[PDB]
Curated annotation (Swiss-Prot):
Free-text comment on the cofactor: Binds 2 calcium ions per subunit.
Active site: 39 (charge relay system), 69 (charge relay system), 224 (charge relay system)
Binding site for Ca(2+) 1: 175, 177, 200
UniProt protein name: Proteinase K
Annotated S-S bridges: 34-123, 178-249
Full-sequence range covered: 106 to 384 of 384
Broad EC category: hydrolase
The species this protein was found in: Parengyodontium album
Length: 279
C-alpha cells in the first residue's frame, strides 16, 4: 500500500533515503495488534481514529485528552493519515494530567495497569505500549517499564528532549525496553534528542504532523513524537509475524537504516526505524 503526500516521518520509516513523501506499508497495517498510548489520553472521537481508539483508564477526573500530546502520539501510532499502523487498536491510559504532568506513582500504576489490562483485550498479533513521557532517573519507573516489557508488551519509551545522555532519565534508561531517539527530515539527530548507549533506535521526531484535540491536526517535535513511530512500527511488524513483543525492539534495530543519521554522538547507535517494506 502507498499513502501519497504522507507526513515526512511516515515516508521516512519506509524509505532507505530521506526526502521522499510516500508511505509504503503492508496493508495488514497492524490488524489485530494493540498499542497502549500511556499519556494525556486520546480524543477517541477524532475522525482520524475511525473508532479504533478508546480510553481504557484515567487517574484524573476525566479521561479526555485536555492536552493534545496523547492524541498526537496516538495519531502517529495508528490514525488513518498520520499513523504507522493504520489498522491497530489504540488504548489510552491517561497518566498525565492535561498540563502533561503526572506523578511517577501514577505513571507506574499505569504501566502495571497495561500489563494486566492486555488480558482484557483482544490483541492476537501482540501488544505495544507507547510511553511518550519521562523525567529524571527513577529505579521504580524503570522497573515498572521492565515489568511491562517482561509481561509481554513491547515498551517504546522516549529518550527525552534534554540533548543529554538518557542514562539520567526514566523510563528512558531502562535497558530492557526500547528507548527511542528523534531525527529530523534531513536525517540529522533531532536537535533536542537525548542520546547514549541506552538508546536502541531513532524515529522521526522533528515537526511531526499528527492528530490534535478538537478534531484538528498540528506539527510538533520531541522524542515523544519519535516513540509512536516505533510503537506503531512494532505493532505493524508483530501483525506481519516478523517479530514478537520480547524481540521487537531488537528486530527493529537489526532491520534499521544504519549509519544514515548525522550528529549522532560516539557511543550512540546510528539506527533509524525502517519498516523494510518492499512494494
Amino acid at each position: 500500500a502507498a499513502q501519497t503526500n504522507a507526513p515526512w516521518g511516515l515516508a521516512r520509516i519506509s524509505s532507505t533515503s530521506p526526502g521522499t513523501s510516500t508511505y509504503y506499508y503492508d496493508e495488514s497495517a497492524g490488524q489485530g495488534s494493540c498499542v497502549y498510548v500511556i499519556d494525556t489520553g486520546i480524543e477517541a472521537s477524532h475522525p482520524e481514529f475511525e473508532g479504533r481508539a478508546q480510553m481504557v483508564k484515567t487517574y484524573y477526573y476525566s479521561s479526555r485528552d485536555g492536552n493534545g500530546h496523547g492524541t498526537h502520539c496516538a495519531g502517529t501510532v495508528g490514525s488513518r493519515t498520520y499513523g504507522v499502523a493504520k489498522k491497530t487498536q489504540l488504548f489510552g491510559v491517561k497518566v498525565l494530567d492535561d498540563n502533561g504532568s503526572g506523578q511517577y506513582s501514577t505513571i507506574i500504576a499505569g504501566m502495571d495497569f497495561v500489563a494486566s489490562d492486555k488480558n482484557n483485550r483482544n490483541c492476537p498479533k501482540g501488544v505495544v505500549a507507547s510511553l511518550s513521557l519521562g523525567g529524571g532517573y527513577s529505579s521504580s519507573v524503570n522497573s515498572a517499564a521492565a515489568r511491562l516489557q517482561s509481561s509481554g508488551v513491547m515498551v517504546a519509551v522516549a529518550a527525552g528532549n534534554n540533548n543529554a545522555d538518557a542514562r539520567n532519565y526514566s523510563p528512558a534508561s531502562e535497558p530492557s525496553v526500547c528507548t527511542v531517539g528523534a531525527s529530523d527530515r534531513y536525517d540529522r539527530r533531532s536537535s533536542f534528542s537525548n542520546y547514549g548507549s541506552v538508546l536502541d533506535i531513532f524515529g522521526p521526531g522533528t515537526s511531526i504532523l499528527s492528530t490534535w484535540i478538537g478534531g484538528s491536526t498540528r506539527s510538533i517535535s520531541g522524542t515523544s513524537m519519535a516513540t509512536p513511530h516505533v510503537a506503531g512500527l512494532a505493532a505493524y511488524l508483530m501483525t506481519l509475524g516478523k517479530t514478537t513483543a520480547a524481540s521487537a525492539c531488537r528486530y527493529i534495530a537489526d532491520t534499521a537504516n544504519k549509519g544514515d543519521l548525522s550528529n549522532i554522538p560516539f557511543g550512540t547507535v546510528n539506527l533509524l526505524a525502517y519498516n523494510n517494506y518492499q512494494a
